[PDB]
Symmetry: C3
């Protein structure tokens, strides 16, 4: 029968979260899961549908445009960008976590230090596994990063065929490129259609996440949730804003534009499954060239270490203090750095944080055996994980946009007409 | 060689069925399975091959033509039709099982967490490429319709790059679809040999078993088809102004293929080519209605389940009135919607229905002994179950077609 | 401080790697070879694996769209006759070269059980889901679907309706564009090829080269003398008979041969074999896009050598007497049971194991025949290298011979 407002996706967030909270406090969280949540599963399923086609096609079309040496430059830039913001996330994660003093109370356990054969991640085979041995297979499996490799090789090769002298060579290559282009275009059209549904699906998703885990943010857990979020906020408001401003980009204009991707990132808790919304934003909103965002955006849905360095800095310090194990500021740095290195090869998927935490705890030598104190801390964190996941993913997508727009500004943004107010 | 002539497919059927019957009664069915059967396995393998490309390509081209408001309309029509014809199937199955009094004798036993969100939600594919790679027809149908609908909006868009890119893309799908129909055309030159091999086996293996009280079950289920086709499909066709006798003559290839092949979804290339090359239906209709009804069509299930639930009921002595027999069959029919046509489905579903009502299927108990009898004629039954579906799948595709763009009346006059 | 491209490097990367491998191996450093060197060659292998499915699908839709279904059937029957001809030669040489070297040198004793000793595979050529078969990496069904598509596209481009024709050309144009792209990229990888070839033989030599001392030297010795004879006698003589200069052939086949050798996969060398077939032998896409991937599957040459030698090494080590006749019957059986499989590393030991079972020999642990099998298995990589290399070479020789019989045709590629 409706609805007129176009500021709705943000309305659906707030109304949903408030509805979720109330439904949960009154014991009705069970009912949300049944009647409301599946609408958000639909929202989520549809976005999932577009991720392989949009990413594959947009990057064939984008590496075919621009050029391989310029493409190379955009890599070094988006990577230098991610080290910079990663150090800030690490630093803020340590600071924000100490301030709230998250290990408030109360149980005792048995200390340890780095133990059980102390190996950092393999990370050779992680690299060799970028090059897909069957492009068709990597498309059928969800694998983003090999598709990125094959899409870039296909694109660069396509362009080389179009400067070849023979006419058959040039007309065939172009028909091919034309097909990816038409495909990419259809995809972007569709996500716009999906986004018409988005505020209902955004509503259903925090309604559930709030009714389930919203009731749990009481007590000593409030402080970790409280800490992880002032940490996000600091990362955005200081390191992203200051970074945008230094490159001559208005920080407030950016957020009004990034908003759809941010809210979607948040509720969806998947970088890879927000990629369709993010990319359309990079194009229809930020005015970024496909030759840029088709590479940097899906690459950063994997490589961005910001939200893990944030999350990991807080929860390691929470476990450390609940179980009584003294952790100096330095050893926390070396732990978070290990988790961050260890996270790089894997893309953003919901649940990733608790999973990664379990790994750093084990490896550092703690016993995660049942009823143990340290198994009890992890289990507390694990119970607010969706709440934390939402902010982990959202801080990542935001910075994913923020670096895409900076690197773009550095060659062909170029479209400044996209930002003028009237 | 060389044999080529036409209209062999009806010949391969009758001749193979006779070869099979003769071969089975003298006990040589092992040799039929070894030496003859694989030739028919090949006919089935080739048709399976064309199903994903034919369905993907034909619907992207078909939904790119026409328009989404019209597309929605035919959806509603083909759904109303598949409901309507289902009622007739329920009714006839209920009656023929009673008339034949299929359950007869003699052994004794006693008797009397839903979802349907995740089923609907599972229509939307999370990886379109995986869904093409796995079988998954219903999600491909979804992605193909979105893709086509989207392609058309781009071809009406003002920008010049956009418009020619979209049309390039559409042409690739058109070219592919065009190639597929050529190939399925080719396989149909081979079809009567494979139709021959397939009933040759089905007659040689399970044919000798159709003696006795099981014949009454077969008699009842086949009286249901004939009654469904000849009464409710014919009457429905005449009601919308379509000649019932020309229809059968044309569906003939898809029907015989449906019958022998026992896969609704795997007769789909032949059905679609029949739907187009014979019935003269536009791609914009059958590229939706035919593969959708190869999943959603409930007719042959209400027939099969009506006869055998009543057969089990009477064999084990558990009384079910005409009314409570209906309520069981309605349940089995609802549970069938999310699933496409597959050669084991009848017995699998039968087993499930015995379960839910609480009957004990442990060996060697009567309800287990009753089901085990049905399971032994299942192929004879599966052949008629699918043949009636593809027949009705065509009939609604053409009826729904007649109401907008059938439109081609030159194909029959 | 490295240029490096002097561009005759792929044969250099091999010898320097092989020698580096031996030398590094004798000094016990193979552990470091496995870590620091090896992955550079795994990279080389991974890039080529990537290109196989598109290079093959695209090349054959375009190649079967060109030429014509009656001619294609002839090059089919011709390439099959070729592969039978060259196989009998491999069996013959495998029997002779193994006896000549007399591979059963030493020492242990055994009996075993005896003495004494399809359809669904063919049906499995026809893929029930082409999209699945592309993803699962199944060459023969992709080959089948590629030919039917190519043939149908050609018929559609002859159809009277203009739309049908313009669509079909679009479709065909997409595949040609793709194929052309692939060949471009494999051209690029070959720039990297000698570094990766160095790394691979470096590893294979550092690990298994050290084992080739003693009575295993003879089996490695006999198999390579078998390879040398197959190429230098039956490929050459067959090439001359059909009028092709044998020494020019080898210089051209060189990139594919070495890639084959080092990667030990007939099918994952396919991109390099197909590029050679095109940019070097001057063979038409309509010929080689069929014969080469088909021969990466059906070619029995390299198997008859491995099985002719190793069945006899097991035979003589285990003391079980085999007449020249009974050795023949085992190898023929092993070859028949072998066809459906594409080139994969480790394939040799795998097949040997089976013939041992079926003949009734007992492979129980600590057994004599079990002990013999293990020795062969320990030099298997060394044997694999020469096994697949001979196939890829002969794959080319039959591809250009059947090519010579219709449209090779490009004689301009070899002159002055």
């Amino acid at each position: 029968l409706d609805y007129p407002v176009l500021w709705k996706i943000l309305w659906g967030l707030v109304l949903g979260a408030v509805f979720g909270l109330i439904a949960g406090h009154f014991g009705y969280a069970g009912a949300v899961k049944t009647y409301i949540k599946p609408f958000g599963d639909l929202f989520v399923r549809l976005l999932k549908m577009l991720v392989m086609p949009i990413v594959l096609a947009s990057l064939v079309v984008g590496a075919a445009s621009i050029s391989p040496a310029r493409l190379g430059r955009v890599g070094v830039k988006i990577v230098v960008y991610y080290l910079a913001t990663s150090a800030m996330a690490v630093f803020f994660g340590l600071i924000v976590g100490r301030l709230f003093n998250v290990g408030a109370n109360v149980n005792l356990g048995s200390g340890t230090g780095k133990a059980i054969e102390a190996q950092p991640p393999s990370l050779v085979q992680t690299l060799l596994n970028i090059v897909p041995t069957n492009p068709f297979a990597s498309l059928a499996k969800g694998e983003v990063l090999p598709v990125i490799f094959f899409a870039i090789i296909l694109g660069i090769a396509i362009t080389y065929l179009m400067n070849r002298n023979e006419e058959r060579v040039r007309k065939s290559a172009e028909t091919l490129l034309r097909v990816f282009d038409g495909l990419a275009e259809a995809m972007y059209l569709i996500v716009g259609g999906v986004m018409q549904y988005a505020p209902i699906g955004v509503f259903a998703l925090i309604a559930y996440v709030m009714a389930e885990q919203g009731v749990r943010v009481v007590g000593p857990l409030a402080k970790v949730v409280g800490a992880v979020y002032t940490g996000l906020f600091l990362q955005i408001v200081i390191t992203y804003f200051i970074l945008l401003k230094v490159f001559g980009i208005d920080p407030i204009k950016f957020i009004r534009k990034a908003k759809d991707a941010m809210i979607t990132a948040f509720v969806t808790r998947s970088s890879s499954g927000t990629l369709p919304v993010t990319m359309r934003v990079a194009e229809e909103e930020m005015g970024v060239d496909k030759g840029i965002f088709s590479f940097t955006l899906p690459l950063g849905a994997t490589i961005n270490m910001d939200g893990t360095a944030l999350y990991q800095g807080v929860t390691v310090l929470f476990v450390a203090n609940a179980i009584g194990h003294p952790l100096t500021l330095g050893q926390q740095l070396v732990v978070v750095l290990t988790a961050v290195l260890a996270s790089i090869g894997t893309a953003g998927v919901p649940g990733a944080g608790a999973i990664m935490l379990a790994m750093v705890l084990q490896s550092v030598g703690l016993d995660l055996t049942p009823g143990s104190p340290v198994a009890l801390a992890y289990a507390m964190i694990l119970g607010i994980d969706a709440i934390l996941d939402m902010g982990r993913t959202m801080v990542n997508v935001t910075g994913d946009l923020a670096g895409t727009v900076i690197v773009a500004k550095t060659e062909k943004e170029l479209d400044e007409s996209k930002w003028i107010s009237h």
